Amino acid sequence: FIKDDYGPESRGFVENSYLAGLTPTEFFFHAMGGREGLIDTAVKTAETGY
DNA sequence: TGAGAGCGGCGGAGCCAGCAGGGAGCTGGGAGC
RNA sequence: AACCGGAGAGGGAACCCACUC
DNA sequence: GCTCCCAGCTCCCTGCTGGCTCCGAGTGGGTTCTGCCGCTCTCA
């Protein structure tokens, strides 16, 4: 991407569906999104149990 | 006194205790008589 | 011609990997 | 000699910095590891 690109494609918006598949940039961004939830699942338990 | 051997020794957050600095308040030395 | 069974040992520390959430 | 007002000492207070304890529940495997050098006394 060009420097200082605030457009939807350049910041994480995925305009494709899971039926049409994702472009490589959208695939990486989607991985970045899923990683956050996966981390919170492990972090949350240590607080809730305490 | 030499081999066998016994052992002698060489990360982060958040509550509690101490310290430092700063005033109100009391008592001796001087101000008037 | 003459009795003829029978057990008992494995423990701890540390580390890593993995699983279910 | 008399009462009294102003600085020096006593107290408490506030504020700040250093020190101790906690950090989900289960489960299954495997692997390594439990000290070592030598120094003096004894049997031969």
Coordinates of N, CA, C and O (backbone and C1' of nucleotides) in Angstrom, one line a residue, chain D:
Chain D
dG1 P 13.7 40.3 93.4 O5' 12.5 41.2 92.9 C5' 11.6 41.9 93.9 C4' 10.4 42.5 93.2 C3' 9.6 41.5 92.3 O3' 8.2 41.7 92.6 C1' 10.2 43.5 91.1
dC2 P 7.2 40.4 92.4 O5' 6.3 40.8 91.2 C5' 5.3 41.8 91.3 C4' 4.7 42.2 90.0 C3' 4.4 41.0 89.1 O3' 3.0 40.8 89.0 C1' 5.6 42.8 87.9
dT3 P 2.5 39.4 88.3 O5' 2.0 39.9 86.9 C5' 1.2 41.1 86.7 C4' 1.1 41.5 85.3 C3' 0.7 40.4 84.3 O3' -0.3 40.8 83.4 C1' 2.8 41.4 83.6
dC4 P -0.9 39.8 82.3 O5' -0.1 40.1 81.0 C5' 0.1 41.4 80.6 C4' 1.2 41.5 79.5 C3' 1.0 40.5 78.4 O3' 0.9 41.2 77.2 C1' 3.3 40.6 79.2
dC5 P 0.4 40.4 75.9 O5' 1.6 40.5 74.8 C5' 2.1 41.7 74.4 C4' 3.4 41.5 73.7 C3' 3.4 40.7 72.5 O3' 4.3 41.2 71.5 C1' 4.9 39.7 74.0
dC6 P 4.2 40.7 69.9 O5' 5.8 40.3 69.7 C5' 6.5 39.7 70.7 C4' 7.9 39.4 70.2 C3' 8.0 38.7 68.9 O3' 9.4 38.8 68.4 C1' 8.4 37.1 70.7
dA7 P 9.9 37.9 67.2 O5' 10.7 36.7 67.9 C5' 11.6 36.0 67.3 C4' 12.5 35.2 68.2 C3' 13.0 33.8 67.7 O3' 14.2 33.4 68.4 C1' 11.4 33.5 69.4
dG8 P 15.0 32.2 67.9 O5' 14.6 31.0 68.9 C5' 15.5 30.7 69.9 C4' 15.0 29.5 70.8 C3' 15.2 28.1 70.1 O3' 15.5 27.1 71.1 C1' 12.9 28.5 70.5
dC9 P 15.8 25.6 70.6 O5' 14.6 24.7 71.1 C5' 14.5 24.4 72.5 C4' 13.2 23.8 72.8 C3' 13.0 22.4 72.3 O3' 12.3 21.6 73.3 C1' 11.2 23.7 71.5
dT10 P 12.0 20.0 73.0 O5' 10.4 20.0 72.7 C5' 9.5 20.4 73.7 C4' 8.1 19.7 73.5 C3' 8.1 18.3 72.9 O3' 7.0 17.6 73.5 C1' 7.1 19.8 71.4
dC11 P 6.9 16.0 73.1 O5' 5.6 16.0 72.2 C5' 4.4 16.7 72.6 C4' 3.5 17.0 71.3 C3' 3.3 15.9 70.4 O3' 2.0 15.3 70.6 C1' 3.8 18.0 69.2
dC12 P 1.7 13.8 70.1 O5' 0.8 14.1 68.8 C5' -0.1 15.2 68.8 C4' -0.4 15.7 67.4 C3' -0.8 14.6 66.4 O3' -2.1 14.8 66.0 C1' 1.0 16.0 65.5
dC13 P -2.8 13.7 65.0 O5' -2.6 14.3 63.6 C5' -2.7 15.7 63.4 C4' -2.1 16.1 62.1 C3' -2.3 15.1 60.9 O3' -3.3 15.6 60.0 C1' 0.0 15.9 61.0
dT14 P -3.9 14.7 58.9 O5' -3.0 15.0 57.6 C5' -2.6 16.3 57.3 C4' -1.4 16.3 56.3 C3' -1.6 15.4 55.1 O3' -1.6 16.1 53.9 C1' 0.6 15.1 56.2
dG15 P -2.0 15.4 52.6 O5' -0.6 15.0 52.0 C5' 0.5 16.0 51.9 C4' 1.8 15.3 51.7 C3' 1.9 14.2 50.6 O3' 2.7 14.7 49.5 C1' 3.0 13.5 52.6
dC16 P 2.8 13.8 48.2 O5' 4.0 12.8 48.5 C5' 5.3 13.3 48.9 C4' 6.3 12.2 49.2 C3' 6.4 11.1 48.2 O3' 7.7 11.1 47.7 C1' 6.1 10.2 50.4
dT17 P 8.1 10.1 46.5 O5' 8.7 8.8 47.3 C5' 9.9 8.9 48.0 C4' 10.3 7.6 48.7 C3' 10.5 6.4 47.7 O3' 11.6 5.7 48.1 C1' 8.9 5.9 49.4
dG18 P 12.2 4.6 47.1 O5' 12.1 3.3 48.0 C5' 12.9 3.1 49.2 C4' 12.3 2.0 50.1 C3' 12.4 0.6 49.6 O3' 12.8 -0.3 50.6 C1' 10.1 1.1 50.1
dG19 P 13.1 -1.8 50.2 O5' 11.8 -2.6 50.8 C5' 11.6 -2.9 52.2 C4' 10.4 -3.7 52.4 C3' 10.4 -5.1 51.7 O3' 9.8 -6.1 52.5 C1' 8.5 -3.9 51.1
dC20 P 9.9 -7.6 52.2 O5' 8.4 -8.2 52.1 C5' 7.6 -8.1 53.2 C4' 6.2 -8.8 52.8 C3' 6.3 -10.1 52.1 O3' 5.2 -10.9 52.4 C1' 5.3 -8.5 50.7
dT21 P 5.1 -12.4 52.0 O5' 3.8 -12.5 51.1 C5' 2.6 -12.0 51.5 C4' 1.5 -12.1 50.4 C3' 1.6 -13.3 49.5 O3' 0.4 -13.8 49.2 C1' 1.8 -11.4 48.2
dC22 P 0.2 -15.3 48.8 O5' -0.7 -15.2 47.4 C5' -1.9 -14.6 47.4 C4' -2.4 -14.2 46.0 C3' -2.0 -15.2 44.9 O3' -3.0 -16.0 44.6 C1' -1.3 -12.9 44.3
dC23 P -2.8 -17.4 43.7 O5' -2.8 -16.8 42.2 C5' -4.0 -16.2 41.7 C4' -3.6 -15.4 40.4 C3' -2.9 -16.3 39.4 O3' -3.8 -17.0 38.6 C1' -1.9 -14.1 39.6
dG24 P -3.7 -18.6 38.4 O5' -5.1 -19.1 38.8 C5' -6.3 -18.5 38.1 C4' -7.4 -19.4 38.2 C3' -7.1 -20.9 38.2 O3' -7.0 -21.4 39.5 C1' -8.6 -20.4 36.4
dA25 P -6.2 -22.7 39.8 O5' -7.2 -23.9 39.3 C5' -8.5 -24.0 39.8 C4' -9.3 -25.1 39.1 C3' -8.5 -26.4 38.9 O3' -8.7 -27.2 40.1 C1' -9.6 -25.8 36.9
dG26 P -7.8 -28.5 40.3 O5' -8.5 -29.6 39.5 C5' -7.8 -30.6 38.9 C4' -8.5 -31.1 37.6 C3' -7.8 -32.1 36.8 O3' -8.0 -33.4 37.4 C1' -8.7 -30.4 35.4
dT27 P -6.8 -34.3 37.7 O5' -6.5 -35.0 36.3 C5' -7.5 -35.4 35.4 C4' -7.1 -35.5 34.0 C3' -5.8 -36.2 33.7 O3' -5.9 -37.6 33.8 C1' -6.1 -34.3 32.3
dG28 P -4.7 -38.5 34.2 O5' -3.9 -38.7 32.8 C5' -4.6 -39.0 31.6 C4' -3.7 -38.8 30.4 C3' -2.3 -39.4 30.6 O3' -2.3 -40.7 30.1 C1' -2.2 -37.2 29.6
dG29 P -1.0 -41.6 30.3 O5' -0.2 -41.3 29.0 C5' 1.2 -41.6 29.0 C4' 1.9 -40.5 28.1 C3' 3.4 -40.6 28.2 O3' 3.9 -41.5 27.3 C1' 2.5 -38.3 28.2
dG30 P 5.1 -42.5 27.7 O5' 6.4 -41.7 27.3 C5' 6.5 -40.9 26.1 C4' 7.4 -39.8 26.3 C3' 8.8 -40.2 26.9 O3' 9.8 -40.0 25.9 C1' 8.0 -38.2 27.9
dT31 P 11.2 -40.8 26.0 O5' 12.2 -39.8 26.7 C5' 12.1 -38.4 26.5 C4' 12.9 -37.6 27.4 C3' 14.0 -38.4 28.2 O3' 15.3 -37.8 27.8 C1' 12.8 -37.0 29.7
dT32 P 16.7 -38.6 28.3 O5' 17.2 -37.8 29.5 C5' 17.1 -36.4 29.5 C4' 17.5 -35.8 30.9 C3' 18.5 -36.6 31.7 O3' 19.5 -35.8 32.2 C1' 16.6 -36.2 33.0
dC33 P 21.0 -36.4 32.7 O5' 20.8 -36.3 34.3 C5' 20.1 -35.2 34.9 C4' 19.8 -35.6 36.3 C3' 20.5 -36.8 36.9 O3' 21.7 -36.4 37.7 C1' 18.2 -36.7 37.6
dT34 P 21.8 -35.2 38.7 O5' 22.6 -35.8 39.9 C5' 22.4 -37.2 40.4 C4' 21.6 -37.1 41.7 C3' 21.8 -38.4 42.6 O3' 22.9 -38.3 43.5 C1' 19.4 -37.7 42.4
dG35 P 23.3 -36.9 44.2 O5' 24.2 -36.2 43.1 C5' 24.6 -34.8 43.2 C4' 25.9 -34.6 42.5 C3' 26.7 -35.9 42.2 O3' 27.4 -35.7 41.0 C1' 27.8 -34.5 43.8
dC36 P 28.6 -36.7 40.5 O5' 29.9 -36.1 41.1 C5' 30.3 -34.8 40.8 C4' 31.6 -34.4 41.4 C3' 32.7 -35.4 41.2 O3' 34.0 -34.8 40.8 C1' 32.5 -35.0 43.5
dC37 P 35.2 -35.6 40.2 O5' 36.4 -34.9 41.0 C5' 36.2 -34.0 42.0 C4' 37.4 -33.4 42.7 C3' 38.7 -34.3 42.5 O3' 39.8 -33.4 42.6 C1' 37.8 -34.5 44.7
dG38 P 41.3 -34.1 42.7 O5' 41.6 -34.4 44.2 C5' 41.5 -33.4 45.2 C4' 41.6 -33.9 46.6 C3' 42.8 -34.8 46.8 O3' 43.4 -34.6 48.1 C1' 40.8 -36.0 47.4
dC39 P 44.4 -33.4 48.3 O5' 44.3 -32.8 49.8 C5' 43.0 -33.0 50.5 C4' 43.1 -34.2 51.4 C3' 44.4 -34.8 51.7 O3' 44.9 -34.4 53.0 C1' 42.7 -36.5 51.6
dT40 P 46.3 -34.9 53.6 O5' 45.9 -36.0 54.7 C5' 45.1 -35.7 55.8 C4' 44.5 -36.9 56.5 C3' 45.6 -37.8 57.1 O3' 45.2 -38.1 58.5 C1' 44.3 -39.0 55.6
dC41 P 46.1 -39.0 59.4 O5' 45.4 -40.4 59.4 C5' 44.1 -40.6 60.1 C4' 43.5 -42.0 59.9 C3' 44.4 -43.1 60.4 O3' 43.6 -44.1 61.1 C1' 44.0 -43.4 58.1
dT42 P 44.2 -45.4 61.8 O5' 43.9 -46.6 60.7 C5' 42.6 -47.0 60.5 C4' 42.6 -48.2 59.6 C3' 43.4 -49.4 60.0 O3' 42.7 -50.6 59.8 C1' 44.2 -48.7 57.9
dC43 P 43.3 -52.1 60.2 O5' 43.7 -52.8 58.9 C5' 42.6 -53.2 58.0 C4' 43.2 -53.9 56.8 C3' 43.9 -55.2 57.1 O3' 43.8 -56.2 56.0 C1' 45.5 -53.7 56.3
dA44 P 44.6 -57.5 56.0 O5' 45.9 -57.2 55.1 C5' 45.8 -57.0 53.7 C4' 47.2 -56.6 53.2 C3' 48.3 -57.7 53.4 O3' 49.0 -57.8 52.2 C1' 49.0 -55.6 54.3

